[PDB]
Amino acid sequence: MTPYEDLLRFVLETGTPKSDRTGTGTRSLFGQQMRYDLSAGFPLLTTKKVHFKSVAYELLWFLRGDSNIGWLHEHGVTIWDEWASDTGELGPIYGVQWRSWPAPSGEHIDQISAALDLLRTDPDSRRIIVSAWNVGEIERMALPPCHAFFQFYVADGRLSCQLYQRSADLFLGVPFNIASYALLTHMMAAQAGLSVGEFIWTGGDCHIYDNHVEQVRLQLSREPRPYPKLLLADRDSIFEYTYEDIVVKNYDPHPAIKAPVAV
Amino acid sequence: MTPYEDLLRFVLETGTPKSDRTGTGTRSLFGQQMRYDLSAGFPLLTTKKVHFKSVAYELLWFLRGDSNIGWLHEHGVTIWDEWASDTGELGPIYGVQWRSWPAPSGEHIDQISAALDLLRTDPDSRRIIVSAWNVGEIERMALPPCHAFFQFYVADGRLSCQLYQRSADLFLGVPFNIASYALLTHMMAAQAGLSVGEFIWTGGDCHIYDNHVEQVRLQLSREPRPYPKLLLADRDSIFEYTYEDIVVKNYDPHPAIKAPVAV
Ligand SMILES: Nc1nc(=O)c2c(CCc3ccc(C(=O)N[C@@H](CCC(=O)O)C(=O)O)cc3)c[nH]c2[nH]1
Ligand SMILES: Nc1nc(=O)c2c(CCc3ccc(C(=O)N[C@@H](CCC(=O)O)C(=O)O)cc3)c[nH]c2[nH]1
Numbered sequence: 001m002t003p004y005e006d007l008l009r010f011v012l013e014t015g016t017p018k019s020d021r022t023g024t025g026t027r028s029l030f031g032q033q034m035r036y037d038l039s040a041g042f043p044l045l046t047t048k049k050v051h052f053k054s055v056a057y058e059l060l061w062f063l064r065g066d067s068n069i070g071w072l073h074e075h076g077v078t079i080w081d082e083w084a085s086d087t088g089e090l091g092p093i094y095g096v097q098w099r100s101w102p103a104p105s106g107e108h109i110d111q112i113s114a115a116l117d118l119l120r121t122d123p124d125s126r127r128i129i130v131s132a133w134n135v136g137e138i139e140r141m142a143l144p145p146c147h148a149f150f151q152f153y154v155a156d157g158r159l160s161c162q163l164y165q166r167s168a169d170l171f172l173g174v175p176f177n178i179a180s181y182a183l184l185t186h187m188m189a190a191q192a193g194l195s196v197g198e199f200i201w202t203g204g205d206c207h208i209y210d211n212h213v214e215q216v217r218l219q220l221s222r223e224p225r226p227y228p229k230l231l232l233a234d235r236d237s238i239f240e241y242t243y244e245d246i247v248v249k250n251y252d253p254h255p256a257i258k259a260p261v262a263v
Numbered sequence: 264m265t266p267y268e269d270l271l272r273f274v275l276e277t278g279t280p281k282s283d284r285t286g287t288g289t290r291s292l293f294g295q296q297m298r299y300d301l302s303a304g305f306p307l308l309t310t311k312k313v314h315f316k317s318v319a320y321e322l323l324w325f326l327r328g329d330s331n332i333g334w335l336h337e338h339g340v341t342i343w344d345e346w347a348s349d350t351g352e353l354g355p356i357y358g359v360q361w362r363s364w365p366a367p368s369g370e371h372i373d374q375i376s377a378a379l380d381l382l383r384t385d386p387d388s389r390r391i392i393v394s395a396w397n398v399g400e401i402e403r404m405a406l407p408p409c410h411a412f413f414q415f416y417v418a419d420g421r422l423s424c425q426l427y428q429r430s431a432d433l434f435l436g437v438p439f440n441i442a443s444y445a446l447l448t449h450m451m452a453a454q455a456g457l458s459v460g461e462f463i464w465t466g467g468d469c470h471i472y473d474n475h476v477e478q479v480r481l482q483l484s485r486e487p488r489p490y491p492k493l494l495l496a497d498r499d500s501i502f503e504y505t506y507e508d509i510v511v512k513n514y515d516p517h518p519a520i521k522a523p524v525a526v
């Protein structure tokens with residue numbers, strides 16, 4: 001069961017050559033989807049060693065409502081370096097919108113807490129939504145949100161999550177995005193008293209950068225292994241999880257594959 | 264080629280019983296997708312007669328940035344009646360967000376014009392996005408946006424559009440939503456000098472209302488016919504299209520099937 005590798009393969013073989021903002025060049029398809037059953041295992045890719053430490057801290061950083069890379073650096077995470085100001089600022093990106101979307105009245109909306117409240121008290125709501133796409137603040141962001149809009153759903157005590165990702169760096173970004181949202185779904189489920197269901201990833205521009213092609217072919221030559229299991233320590237609040245609360249059990253990946261990020 | 268009917272059938276057979284805000288009861292699935300090749304024909308369903316007049320005026324109404332039902336009524340369209348105030352107001356819904364999203368600076372952002380500008384000047388942009396999900400204004404809206412977030416993509420001068428729809432009334436709402444966004448994509452393509460490509464519909468809570476079940480079974484018993492063709496008269500601006508500019512050629516549906524709307 002390898003939704004990611006299958007999509008990666010499909011784009012590599014059928015994607016159209018496309019120019020891009022970074023001036024790197026891509027092969028690209030539009031409107032592709034992946035589904036993972038989280039109850040079957042944690043979707044941390046096994047066909048290459050994914051630096052889950054960076055995934056976990058990045059998500060914790062989002063949950064803090066932070067947009068300065070300082071806290072990431074203190075924890076040894078450098079994935080946001082290339083877009084940050086000299087003072088470490090990224091503008092009001094993901095975390096700021098998730099935790100403190102500025103409402104016209106001057107109040108700040110905590111969408112994460114609001115979503116959790118709905119999961120607990122109105123699980124059948126069709127409005128359990130979090131958006132990072134704050135149209136009036138996009139221009140202030142170092143990069144507009146890639147993982148932009150997501151929704152939760154509950155069936156028979158099982159929590160599902162669907163993400164709309166407008167732009168998908170398939171080799172570097174997407175493995176992080178999948179693991180990040182899977183982890184978030186486990187967190188939200190834990191806090192809402194639910195089990196985990198499906199993660200559905202829906203992409204806009206799904207692309208392989210032209211300087212990632214050798215890395216992709218290498219990865220696609222490897223046989224998938226069983227997924228690890230995620231174990232999350234007890235906390236009374238999603239905002240109280242720490243890195244140490246997050247345990248990935250039996251992660252047995254093939255070797256890491258290095259590739260340069262498009263800036 | 265019937266993406267809609269196939270999804271309708273899938274939800275009918277496998278959707279799970281779910282309670283809902285309206286108190287009507289539904290059968291529902293999460294994270295379902297449909298794809299239409301707009302170059303093959305205009306996706307106005309032929310398995311029942313769809314009131315395209317209401318579809319077309321509703322879209323024109325959105326493009327006006329209007330949120331009062333008066334203009335709809337003047338043109339014989341009643342589909343928004345049940346949620347409007349006594350003075351016809353719906354709050355800052357689709358049209359208001361599309362044309363005049365209020366920025367923190369006091370300025371209003373015309374996302375439709377902005378998207379068209381990108382299509383014309385930077386077709387490879389991965390940021391051609393329109394959102395109606397204005398978190399700070401949701402509570403003022405009579406209903407939060409169902410068709411919430413959409414994106415355009417251009418490959419070899421061909422325009423595709425993907426919609427994220429968080430909540431999908433499969434029998435009544437979705438046939439309108441499909442035709443609406445197909446029409447919008449034609450309008451954008453015409454204004455940007457592009458041909459039409461794919462419409463990708465991505466749904467969150469995809470449901471059939473419990474009082475639509477008989478109607479659904481009836482529709483699913485019918486053999487689909489060829490789709491009609493859409494002809495748009497020339498205009499120098501998307502905001503100058505009128506109803507009379509929009510011609511559906513050779514629309515040959517099976518009979519209309521009436522159903523009550525859930526409020
Ligand atoms: N073009 C582009 N793609 C993106 O996904 C991205 C984002 C998402 C955050 C991000 C940035 C770089 C890497 C990444 O470099 N991961 C490497 C190294 C991870 C580590 O060891 O530091 C990898 O091999 O996964 C993984 C995730 C910020 N700006 C971006 N710009
Ligand atoms: N539950 C719910 N579903 C929705 O899709 C919806 C929306 C979208 C606009 C909408 C409302 C009713 C009908 C509809 O009734 N169409 C009927 C009659 C069309 C006509 O002839 O006036 C049809 O048979 O398609 C078709 C489209 C507003 N609030 C809603 N609430």
Ligand SMILES: O=c1ccn([C@H]2C[C@H](O)[C@@H](COP(=O)(O)O)O2)c(=O)[nH]1
Binds near residue numbers: 170
């Ligand atoms: O969590 C993220 C953040 C960014 N991107 C990628 C998509 C593009 O390759 C690049 C952003 O560039 P634009 O789409 O904004 O041009 O980073 C991801 O894949 N995942």
Ligand SMILES: O=c1ccn([C@H]2C[C@H](O)[C@@H](COP(=O)(O)O)O2)c(=O)[nH]1
Binds near residue numbers: 284410430431433525
């Ligand atoms: O263009 C639209 C507007 C609304 N809805 C449906 C989805 C739900 O059945 C209802 C909205 O109710 P909530 O999801 O907000 O509870 O209207 C659509 O299918 N298409």
